[PDB]
Tab-separated table of C-alpha atoms and ligand atoms in Angstrom:
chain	number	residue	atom	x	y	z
A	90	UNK	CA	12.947	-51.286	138.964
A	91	UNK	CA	14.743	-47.907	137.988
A	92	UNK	CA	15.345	-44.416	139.291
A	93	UNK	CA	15.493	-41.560	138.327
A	94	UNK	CA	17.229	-37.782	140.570
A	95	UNK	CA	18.018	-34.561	139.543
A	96	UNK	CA	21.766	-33.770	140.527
A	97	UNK	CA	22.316	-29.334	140.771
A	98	UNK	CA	25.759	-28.021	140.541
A	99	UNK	CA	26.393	-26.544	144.524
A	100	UNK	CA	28.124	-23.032	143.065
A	101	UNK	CA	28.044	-21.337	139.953
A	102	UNK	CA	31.739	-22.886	139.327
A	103	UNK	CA	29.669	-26.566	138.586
A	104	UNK	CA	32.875	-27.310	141.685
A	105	UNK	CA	30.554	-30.106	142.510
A	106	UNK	CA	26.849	-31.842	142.172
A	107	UNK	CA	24.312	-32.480	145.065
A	108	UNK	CA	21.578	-35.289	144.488
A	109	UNK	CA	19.185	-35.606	146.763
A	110	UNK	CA	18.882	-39.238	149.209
A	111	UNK	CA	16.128	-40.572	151.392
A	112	UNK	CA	17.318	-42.098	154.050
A	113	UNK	CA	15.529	-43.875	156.847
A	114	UNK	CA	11.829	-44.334	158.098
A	115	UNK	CA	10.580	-41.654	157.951
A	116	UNK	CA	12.685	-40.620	155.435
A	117	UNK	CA	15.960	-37.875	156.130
A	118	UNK	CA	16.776	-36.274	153.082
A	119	UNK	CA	20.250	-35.197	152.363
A	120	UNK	CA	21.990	-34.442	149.547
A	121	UNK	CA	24.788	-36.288	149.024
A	122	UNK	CA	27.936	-36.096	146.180
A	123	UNK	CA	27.425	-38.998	143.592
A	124	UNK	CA	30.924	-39.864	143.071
A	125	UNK	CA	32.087	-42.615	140.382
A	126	UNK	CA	35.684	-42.350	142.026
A	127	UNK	CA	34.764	-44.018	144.736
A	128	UNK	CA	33.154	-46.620	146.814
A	129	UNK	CA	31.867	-45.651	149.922
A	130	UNK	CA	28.123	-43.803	151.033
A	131	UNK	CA	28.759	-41.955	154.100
A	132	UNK	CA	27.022	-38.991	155.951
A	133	UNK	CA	27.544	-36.282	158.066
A	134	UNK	CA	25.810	-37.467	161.114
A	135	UNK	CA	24.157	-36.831	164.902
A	136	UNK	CA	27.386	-38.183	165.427
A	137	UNK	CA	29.786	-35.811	163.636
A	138	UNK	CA	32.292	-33.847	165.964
A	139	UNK	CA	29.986	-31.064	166.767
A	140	UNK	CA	32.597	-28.407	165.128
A	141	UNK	CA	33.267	-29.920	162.236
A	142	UNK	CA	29.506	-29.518	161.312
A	143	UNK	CA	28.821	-26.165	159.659
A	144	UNK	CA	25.410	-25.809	158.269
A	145	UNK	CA	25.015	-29.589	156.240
A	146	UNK	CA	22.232	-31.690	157.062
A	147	UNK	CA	22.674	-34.709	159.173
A	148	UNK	CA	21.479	-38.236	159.448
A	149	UNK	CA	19.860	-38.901	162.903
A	150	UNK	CA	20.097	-43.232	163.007
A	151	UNK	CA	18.184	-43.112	166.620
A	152	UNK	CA	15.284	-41.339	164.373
A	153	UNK	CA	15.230	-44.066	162.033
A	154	UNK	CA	13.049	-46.690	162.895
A	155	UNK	CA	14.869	-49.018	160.180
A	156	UNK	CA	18.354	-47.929	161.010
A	157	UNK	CA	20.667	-50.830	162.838
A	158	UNK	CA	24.195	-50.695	164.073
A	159	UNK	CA	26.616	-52.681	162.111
A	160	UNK	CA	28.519	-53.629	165.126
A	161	UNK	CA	32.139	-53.202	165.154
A	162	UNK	CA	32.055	-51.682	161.656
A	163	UNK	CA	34.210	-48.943	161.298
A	164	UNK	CA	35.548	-46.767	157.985
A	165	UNK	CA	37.918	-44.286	156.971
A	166	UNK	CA	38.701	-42.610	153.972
A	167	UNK	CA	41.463	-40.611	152.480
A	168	UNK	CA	40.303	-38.700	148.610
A	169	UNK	CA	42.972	-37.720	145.822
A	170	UNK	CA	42.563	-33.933	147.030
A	171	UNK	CA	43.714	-34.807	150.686
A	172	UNK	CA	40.621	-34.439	152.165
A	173	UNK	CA	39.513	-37.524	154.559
A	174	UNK	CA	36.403	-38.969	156.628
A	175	UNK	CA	35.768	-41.483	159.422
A	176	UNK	CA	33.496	-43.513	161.346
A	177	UNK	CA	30.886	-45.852	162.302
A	178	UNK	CA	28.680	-47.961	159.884
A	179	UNK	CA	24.857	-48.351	160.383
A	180	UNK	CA	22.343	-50.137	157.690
A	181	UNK	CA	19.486	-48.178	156.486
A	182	UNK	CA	16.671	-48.132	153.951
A	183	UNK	CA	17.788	-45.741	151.214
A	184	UNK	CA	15.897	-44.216	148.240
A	185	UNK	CA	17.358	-41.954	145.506
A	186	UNK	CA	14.982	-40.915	142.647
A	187	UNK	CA	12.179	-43.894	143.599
A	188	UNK	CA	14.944	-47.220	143.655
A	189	UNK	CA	15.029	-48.217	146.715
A	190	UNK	CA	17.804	-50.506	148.651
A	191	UNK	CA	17.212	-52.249	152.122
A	192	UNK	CA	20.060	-52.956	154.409
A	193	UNK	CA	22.479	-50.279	152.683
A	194	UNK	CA	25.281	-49.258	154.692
A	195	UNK	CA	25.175	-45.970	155.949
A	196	UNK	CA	28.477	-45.105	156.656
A	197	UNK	CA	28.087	-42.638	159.320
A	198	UNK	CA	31.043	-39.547	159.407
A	199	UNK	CA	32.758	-38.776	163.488
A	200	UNK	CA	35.150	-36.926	162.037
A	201	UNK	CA	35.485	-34.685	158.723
A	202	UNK	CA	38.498	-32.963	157.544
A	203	UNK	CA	37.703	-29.152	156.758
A	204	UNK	CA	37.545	-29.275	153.499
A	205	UNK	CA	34.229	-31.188	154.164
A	206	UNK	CA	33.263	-28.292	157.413
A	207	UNK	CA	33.540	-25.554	154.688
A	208	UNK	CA	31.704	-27.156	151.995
A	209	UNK	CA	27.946	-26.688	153.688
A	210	UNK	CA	26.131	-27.478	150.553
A	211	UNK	CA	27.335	-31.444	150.082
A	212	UNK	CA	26.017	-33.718	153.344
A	213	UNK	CA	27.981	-36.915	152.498
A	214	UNK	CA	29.131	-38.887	149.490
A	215	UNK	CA	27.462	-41.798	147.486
A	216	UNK	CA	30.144	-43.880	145.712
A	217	UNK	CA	29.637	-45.561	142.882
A	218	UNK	CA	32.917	-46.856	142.097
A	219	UNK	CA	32.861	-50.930	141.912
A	220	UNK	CA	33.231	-52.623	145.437
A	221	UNK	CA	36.315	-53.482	146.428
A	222	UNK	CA	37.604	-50.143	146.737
A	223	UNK	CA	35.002	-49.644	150.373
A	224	UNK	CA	36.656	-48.598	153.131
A	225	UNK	CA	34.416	-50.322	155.397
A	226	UNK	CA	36.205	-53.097	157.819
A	227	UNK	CA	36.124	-55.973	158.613
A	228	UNK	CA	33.689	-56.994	156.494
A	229	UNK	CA	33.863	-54.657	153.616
A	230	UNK	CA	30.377	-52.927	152.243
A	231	UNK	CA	28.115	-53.032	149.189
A	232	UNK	CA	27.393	-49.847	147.088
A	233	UNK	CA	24.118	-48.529	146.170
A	234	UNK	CA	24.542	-49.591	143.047
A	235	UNK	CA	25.916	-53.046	143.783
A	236	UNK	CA	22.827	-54.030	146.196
A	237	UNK	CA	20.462	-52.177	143.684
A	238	UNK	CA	21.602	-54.089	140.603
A	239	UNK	CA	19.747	-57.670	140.853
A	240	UNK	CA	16.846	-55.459	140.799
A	241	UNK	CA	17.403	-53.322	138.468
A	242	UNK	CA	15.383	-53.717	134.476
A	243	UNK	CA	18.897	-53.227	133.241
A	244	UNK	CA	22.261	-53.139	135.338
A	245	UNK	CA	23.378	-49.778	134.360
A	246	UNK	CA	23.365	-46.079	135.714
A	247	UNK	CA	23.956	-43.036	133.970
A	248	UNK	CA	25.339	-39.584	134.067
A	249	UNK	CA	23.618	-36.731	132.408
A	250	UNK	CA	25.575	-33.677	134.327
A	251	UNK	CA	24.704	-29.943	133.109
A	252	UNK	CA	26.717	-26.983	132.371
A	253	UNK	CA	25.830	-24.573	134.875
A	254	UNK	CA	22.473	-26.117	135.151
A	255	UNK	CA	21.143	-29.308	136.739
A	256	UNK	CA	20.871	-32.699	135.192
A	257	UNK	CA	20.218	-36.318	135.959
A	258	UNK	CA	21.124	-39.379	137.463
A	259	UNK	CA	19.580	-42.589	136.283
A	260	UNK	CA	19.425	-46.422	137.393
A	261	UNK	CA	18.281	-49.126	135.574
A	262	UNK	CA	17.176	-47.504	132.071
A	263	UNK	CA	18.797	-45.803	129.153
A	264	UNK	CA	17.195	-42.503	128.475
A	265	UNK	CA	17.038	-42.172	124.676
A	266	UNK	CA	15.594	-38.732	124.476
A	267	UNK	CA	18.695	-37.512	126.813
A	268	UNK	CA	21.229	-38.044	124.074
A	269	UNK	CA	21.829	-36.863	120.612
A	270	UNK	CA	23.246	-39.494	117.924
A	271	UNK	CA	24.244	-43.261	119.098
A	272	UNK	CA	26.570	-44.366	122.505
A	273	UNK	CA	30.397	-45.577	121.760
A	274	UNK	CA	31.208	-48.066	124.399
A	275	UNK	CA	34.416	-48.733	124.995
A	276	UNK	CA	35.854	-51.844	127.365
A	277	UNK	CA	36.641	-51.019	131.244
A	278	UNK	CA	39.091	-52.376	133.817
A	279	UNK	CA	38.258	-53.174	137.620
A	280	UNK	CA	42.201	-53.625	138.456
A	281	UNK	CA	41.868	-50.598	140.676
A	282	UNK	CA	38.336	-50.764	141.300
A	283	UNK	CA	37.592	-47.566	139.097
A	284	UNK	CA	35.799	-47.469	136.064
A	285	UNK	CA	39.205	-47.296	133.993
A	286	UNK	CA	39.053	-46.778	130.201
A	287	UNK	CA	41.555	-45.789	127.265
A	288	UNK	CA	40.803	-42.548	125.543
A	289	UNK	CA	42.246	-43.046	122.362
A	290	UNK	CA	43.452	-39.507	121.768
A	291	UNK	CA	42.304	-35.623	121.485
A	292	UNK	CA	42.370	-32.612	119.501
A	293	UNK	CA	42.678	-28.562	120.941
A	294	UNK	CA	40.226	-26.130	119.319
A	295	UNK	CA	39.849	-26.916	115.403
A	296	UNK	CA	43.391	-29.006	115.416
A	297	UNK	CA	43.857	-32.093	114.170
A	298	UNK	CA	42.850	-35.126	115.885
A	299	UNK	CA	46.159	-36.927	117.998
A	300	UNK	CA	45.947	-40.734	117.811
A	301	UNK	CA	47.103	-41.602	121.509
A	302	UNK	CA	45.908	-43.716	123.660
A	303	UNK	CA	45.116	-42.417	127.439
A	304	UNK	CA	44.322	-44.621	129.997
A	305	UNK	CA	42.406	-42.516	132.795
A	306	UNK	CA	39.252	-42.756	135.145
A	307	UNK	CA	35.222	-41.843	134.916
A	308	UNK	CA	35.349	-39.567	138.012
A	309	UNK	CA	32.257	-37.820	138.489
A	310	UNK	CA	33.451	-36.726	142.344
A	311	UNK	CA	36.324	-34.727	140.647
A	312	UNK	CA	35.845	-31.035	139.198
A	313	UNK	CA	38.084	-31.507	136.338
A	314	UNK	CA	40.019	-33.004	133.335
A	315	UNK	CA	43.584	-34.531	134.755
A	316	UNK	CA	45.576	-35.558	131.425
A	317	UNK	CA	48.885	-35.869	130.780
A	318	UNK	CA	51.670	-32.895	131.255
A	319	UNK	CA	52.273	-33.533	127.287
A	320	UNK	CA	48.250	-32.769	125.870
A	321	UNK	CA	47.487	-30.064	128.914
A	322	UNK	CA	50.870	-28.266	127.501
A	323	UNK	CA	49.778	-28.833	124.343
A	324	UNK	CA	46.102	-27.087	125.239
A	325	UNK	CA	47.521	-24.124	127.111
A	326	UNK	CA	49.859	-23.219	124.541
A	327	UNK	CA	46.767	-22.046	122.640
A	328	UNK	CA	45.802	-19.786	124.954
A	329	UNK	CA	47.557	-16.189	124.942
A	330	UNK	CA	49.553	-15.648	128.740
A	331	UNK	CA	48.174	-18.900	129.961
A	332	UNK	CA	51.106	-20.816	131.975
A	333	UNK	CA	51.559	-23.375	134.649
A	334	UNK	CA	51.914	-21.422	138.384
A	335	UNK	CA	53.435	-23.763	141.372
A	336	UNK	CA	51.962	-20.859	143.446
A	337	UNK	CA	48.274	-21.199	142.300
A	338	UNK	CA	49.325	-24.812	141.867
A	339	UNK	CA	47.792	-25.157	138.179
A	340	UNK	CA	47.304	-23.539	134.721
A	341	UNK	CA	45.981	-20.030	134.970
A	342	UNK	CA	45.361	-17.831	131.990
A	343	UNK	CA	43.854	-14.458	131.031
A	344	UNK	CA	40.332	-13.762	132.324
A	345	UNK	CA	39.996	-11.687	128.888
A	346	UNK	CA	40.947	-14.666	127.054
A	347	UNK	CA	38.096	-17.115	124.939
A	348	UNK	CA	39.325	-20.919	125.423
A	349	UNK	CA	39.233	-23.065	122.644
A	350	UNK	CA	37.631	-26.705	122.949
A	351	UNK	CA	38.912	-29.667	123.601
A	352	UNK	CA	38.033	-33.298	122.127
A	353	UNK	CA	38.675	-36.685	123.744
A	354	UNK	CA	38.303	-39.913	121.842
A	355	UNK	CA	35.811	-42.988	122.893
A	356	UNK	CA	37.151	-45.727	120.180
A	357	UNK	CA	35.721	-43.705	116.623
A	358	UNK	CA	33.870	-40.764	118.555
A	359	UNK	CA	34.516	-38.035	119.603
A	360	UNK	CA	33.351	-35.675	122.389
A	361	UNK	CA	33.924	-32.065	122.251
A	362	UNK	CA	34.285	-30.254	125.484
A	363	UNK	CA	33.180	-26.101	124.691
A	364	UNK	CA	36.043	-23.761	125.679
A	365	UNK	CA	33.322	-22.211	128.173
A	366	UNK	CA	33.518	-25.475	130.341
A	367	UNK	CA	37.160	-25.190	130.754
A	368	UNK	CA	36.774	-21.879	132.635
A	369	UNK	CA	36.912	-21.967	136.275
A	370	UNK	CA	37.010	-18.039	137.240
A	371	UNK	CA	39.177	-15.711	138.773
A	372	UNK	CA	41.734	-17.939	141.100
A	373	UNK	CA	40.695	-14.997	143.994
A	374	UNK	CA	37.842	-12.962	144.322
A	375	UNK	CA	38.651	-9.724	141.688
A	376	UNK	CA	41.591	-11.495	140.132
A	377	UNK	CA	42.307	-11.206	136.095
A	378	UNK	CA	43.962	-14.464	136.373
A	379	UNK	CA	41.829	-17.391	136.133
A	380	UNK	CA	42.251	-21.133	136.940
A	381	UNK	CA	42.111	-23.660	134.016
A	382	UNK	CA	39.804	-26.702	133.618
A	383	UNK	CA	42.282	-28.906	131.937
A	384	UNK	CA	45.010	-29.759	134.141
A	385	UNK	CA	48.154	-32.118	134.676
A	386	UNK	CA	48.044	-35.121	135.931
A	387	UNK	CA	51.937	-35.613	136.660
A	388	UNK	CA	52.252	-37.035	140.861
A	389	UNK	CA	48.296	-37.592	140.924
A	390	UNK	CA	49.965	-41.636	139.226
A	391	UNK	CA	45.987	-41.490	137.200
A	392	UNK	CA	44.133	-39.557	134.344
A	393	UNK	CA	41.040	-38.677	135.537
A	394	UNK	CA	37.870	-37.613	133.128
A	395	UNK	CA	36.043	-35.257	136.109
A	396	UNK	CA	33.433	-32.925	135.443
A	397	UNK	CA	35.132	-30.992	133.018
A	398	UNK	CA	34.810	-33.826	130.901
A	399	UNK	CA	31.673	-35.650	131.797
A	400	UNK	CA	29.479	-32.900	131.523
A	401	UNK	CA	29.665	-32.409	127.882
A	402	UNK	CA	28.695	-36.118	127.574
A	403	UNK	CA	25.558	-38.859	128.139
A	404	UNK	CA	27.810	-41.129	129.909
A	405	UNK	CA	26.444	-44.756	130.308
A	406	UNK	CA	27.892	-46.779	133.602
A	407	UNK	CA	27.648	-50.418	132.592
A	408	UNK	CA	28.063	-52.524	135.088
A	409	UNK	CA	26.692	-55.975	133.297
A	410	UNK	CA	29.012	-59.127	134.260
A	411	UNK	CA	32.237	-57.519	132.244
A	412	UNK	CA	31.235	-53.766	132.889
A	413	UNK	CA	31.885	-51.335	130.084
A	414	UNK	CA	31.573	-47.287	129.565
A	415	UNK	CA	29.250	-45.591	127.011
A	416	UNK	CA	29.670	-41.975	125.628
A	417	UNK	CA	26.882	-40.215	123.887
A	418	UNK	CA	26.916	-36.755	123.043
A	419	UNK	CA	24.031	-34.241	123.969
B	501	LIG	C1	33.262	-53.823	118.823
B	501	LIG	C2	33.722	-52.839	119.889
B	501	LIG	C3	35.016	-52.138	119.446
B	501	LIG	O1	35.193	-50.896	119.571
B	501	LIG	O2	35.819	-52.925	118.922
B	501	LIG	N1	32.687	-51.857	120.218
B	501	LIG	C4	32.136	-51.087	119.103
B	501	LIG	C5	32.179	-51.678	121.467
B	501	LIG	O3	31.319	-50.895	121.739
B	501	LIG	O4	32.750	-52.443	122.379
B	501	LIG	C6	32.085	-52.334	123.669
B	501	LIG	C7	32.585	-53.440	124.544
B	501	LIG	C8	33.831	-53.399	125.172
B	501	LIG	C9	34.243	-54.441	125.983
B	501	LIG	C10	33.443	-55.548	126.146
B	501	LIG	C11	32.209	-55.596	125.547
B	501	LIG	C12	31.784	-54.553	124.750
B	502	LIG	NA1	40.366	-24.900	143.656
């Protein structure tokens, strides 16, 4: 079997990507956050603290003729940007893009924290980081992904996110039309349940390439590129009145100013992020400062390859007996 969804950026910032999710007989569609960061599928819910929902779409289970307690379940989850989630764990029937799981566990939200309330364009996450990172106790969950595979024509999913446009999400199939040249692949480590890789260095604008190697994350639930203090200074000093503020918390440079690009190594390869990717807009409404892509990763303890990053890539999620990343560009 494969799939095959269209994931849309929720704002004109790309600050996220919705896919779409059957869940249920009949089928409740909501559109959930595909996140490679992390591990558990979870929904705002008929049984979300009433004022904590603001506008999202929820999952009824008592509609549901397939839906079934998972009694004594529970979950709870805390992400790297403080924002957190809780509840109660039913199994479901869910479909994205035509693959379809039985039995997947629905990990249904009681409590959001407002980062979530404000946000009324995502309905829930769908991780698709590997396993052992799910939140669900005591007996911990299965991704999508992970009950999906077996069935799958090949056990892979990939990543096709757009510049301020939509793009794909696919399971079980390579696209070879969605890519330009060949894939690098490069080895991955499950010691922290991410899909963990070594960048083996970058260039800023038309530099010169810096042999390094950076060990980071695949993170598709995070907006941007988290590197070390040493290569973000390094990519900010190129840009005229750019600096680091503690009171915007982050790089911020000149609205007037044209970024240059940025290039991250996968073993020989190279993908080039466009200077327009790194621009995230005036840090308040009317501003002339505005907040940079590329950030530090100093006190986050992890590199992480968000959005920023992905997006300029075909990124291929391998997750074949020792899992590996491919990077393709597009
Ligand atoms: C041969 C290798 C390399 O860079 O040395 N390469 C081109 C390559 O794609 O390696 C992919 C891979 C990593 C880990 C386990 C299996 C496969
Ligand atoms: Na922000």
């Amino acid at each position: 079997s494969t799939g095959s969804a269209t994931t849309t950026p929720i704002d004109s910032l790309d600050d996220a990507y919705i896919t779409p999710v059957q869940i249920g007989t009949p089928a409740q569609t909501l559109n959930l956050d595909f996140d490679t960061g992390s591990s558990d599928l979870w929904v705002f819910s008929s049984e979300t603290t009433a004022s904590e929902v603001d506008g999202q779409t929820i999952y009824t289970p008592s509609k549901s003729t397939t839906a079934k307690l998972l009694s004594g379940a529970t979950w709870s989850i805390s992400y790297g940007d403080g924002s957190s989630s809780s509840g109660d764990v039913y199994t479901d029937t869910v479909s994205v893009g035509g693959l379809t799981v039985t039995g997947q566990a629905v990990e249904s939200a009681k409590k959001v924290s407002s980062s979530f309330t404000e946000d009324s364009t995502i309905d829930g996450l769908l991780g698709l980081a590997f396993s052992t990172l799910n939140t669900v106790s005591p007996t911990q969950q299965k991704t999508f992904f992970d009950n999906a595979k077996a069935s799958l024509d090949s056990p892979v999913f990939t990543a096709d996110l757009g510049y301020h446009a939509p793009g794909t999400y696919n399971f079980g199939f390579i696209d070879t039309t969605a890519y330009t040249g060949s894939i690098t692949y490069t080895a991955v480590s499950t010691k922290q349940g991410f899909w963990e890789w070594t960048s083996t260095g970058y260039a800023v604008g038309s530099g010169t390439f810096k042999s390094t190697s950076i060990d980071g994350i695949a993170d598709t639930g995070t907006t941007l590129l988290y590197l070390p203090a040493t290569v973000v200074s390094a990519y900010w000093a190129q840009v005229s009145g750019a600096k680091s503020s503690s009171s915007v918390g982050g790089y911020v440079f000149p609205c007037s100013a044209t970024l240059p690009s940025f290039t991250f190594g996968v073993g020989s390869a190279r993908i080039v992020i466009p200077g327009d990717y790194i621009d995230f807009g005036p840090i308040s409404t009317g501003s002339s400062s505005c907040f940079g892509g590329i950030q530090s990763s100093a006190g986050i303890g992890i590199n992480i390859f968000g959005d920023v990053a992905l997006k300029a890539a075909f990124v291929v999620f391998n997750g074949a007996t020792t899992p590996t990343l491919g990077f393709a560009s597009k």
